[PDB]
Write a protein that binds this ligand. Sequence first.
Ligand SMILES: COc1cc(CN(C)c2cnc3nc(N)nc(N)c3c2)cc(OC)c1OC
Length: 186
Amino acid sequence: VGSLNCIVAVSQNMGIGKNGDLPWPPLRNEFRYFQRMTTTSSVEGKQNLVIMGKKTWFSIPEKNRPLKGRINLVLSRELKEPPQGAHFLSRSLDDALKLTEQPELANKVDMVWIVGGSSVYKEAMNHPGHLKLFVTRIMQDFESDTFFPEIDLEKYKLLPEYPGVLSDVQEEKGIKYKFEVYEKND
Ligand SMILES: COc1cc(CN(C)c2cnc3nc(N)nc(N)c3c2)cc(OC)c1OC
């Protein structure tokens, strides 16, 4: 059950990656907000499902894969079998979601979180239903090679507040950033 959510951290120039790593220096409190938002379920016997494309999965340090206490599904048309550590591999968002109903998965999933990359995010962002986008706006330009698609405002509404989401500008290592929530339903 649950809902369909996208989570992303983006630079002013809409960059989410550079050469297998983040465009910016490590931001520990941002990391920690991603972990908590994706892991938290207040339901007993369920876990959240984290969906990620091949490049996002490999951008995570092996020391952090799989993502503990979450079901990890890799989305890829080119891998031949689930990468070591991953639970499932699916060829598309559709089948991933579909997957979410057979034997293990409809009785075990709470929320669904899409953690990257651009093509997964485009796929989803343009998928029927009630989707939420949790966006961290890093207020600085960073040289990037991977990007999040423009958010078609007035299609997507910004929510003034949402539980567990800080409303204030944050700062780390002198980079300012803020958390934003957007939603849609079609
Ligand atoms: C989970 O651990 C790590 C994950 C990454 C890179 N990824 C995939 C990442 C980081 N931040 C994010 N923040 C928000 N808001 N949304 C995301 N979708 C997101 C995804 C890099 C690391 O170190 C280089 C890690 O080590 C802790």
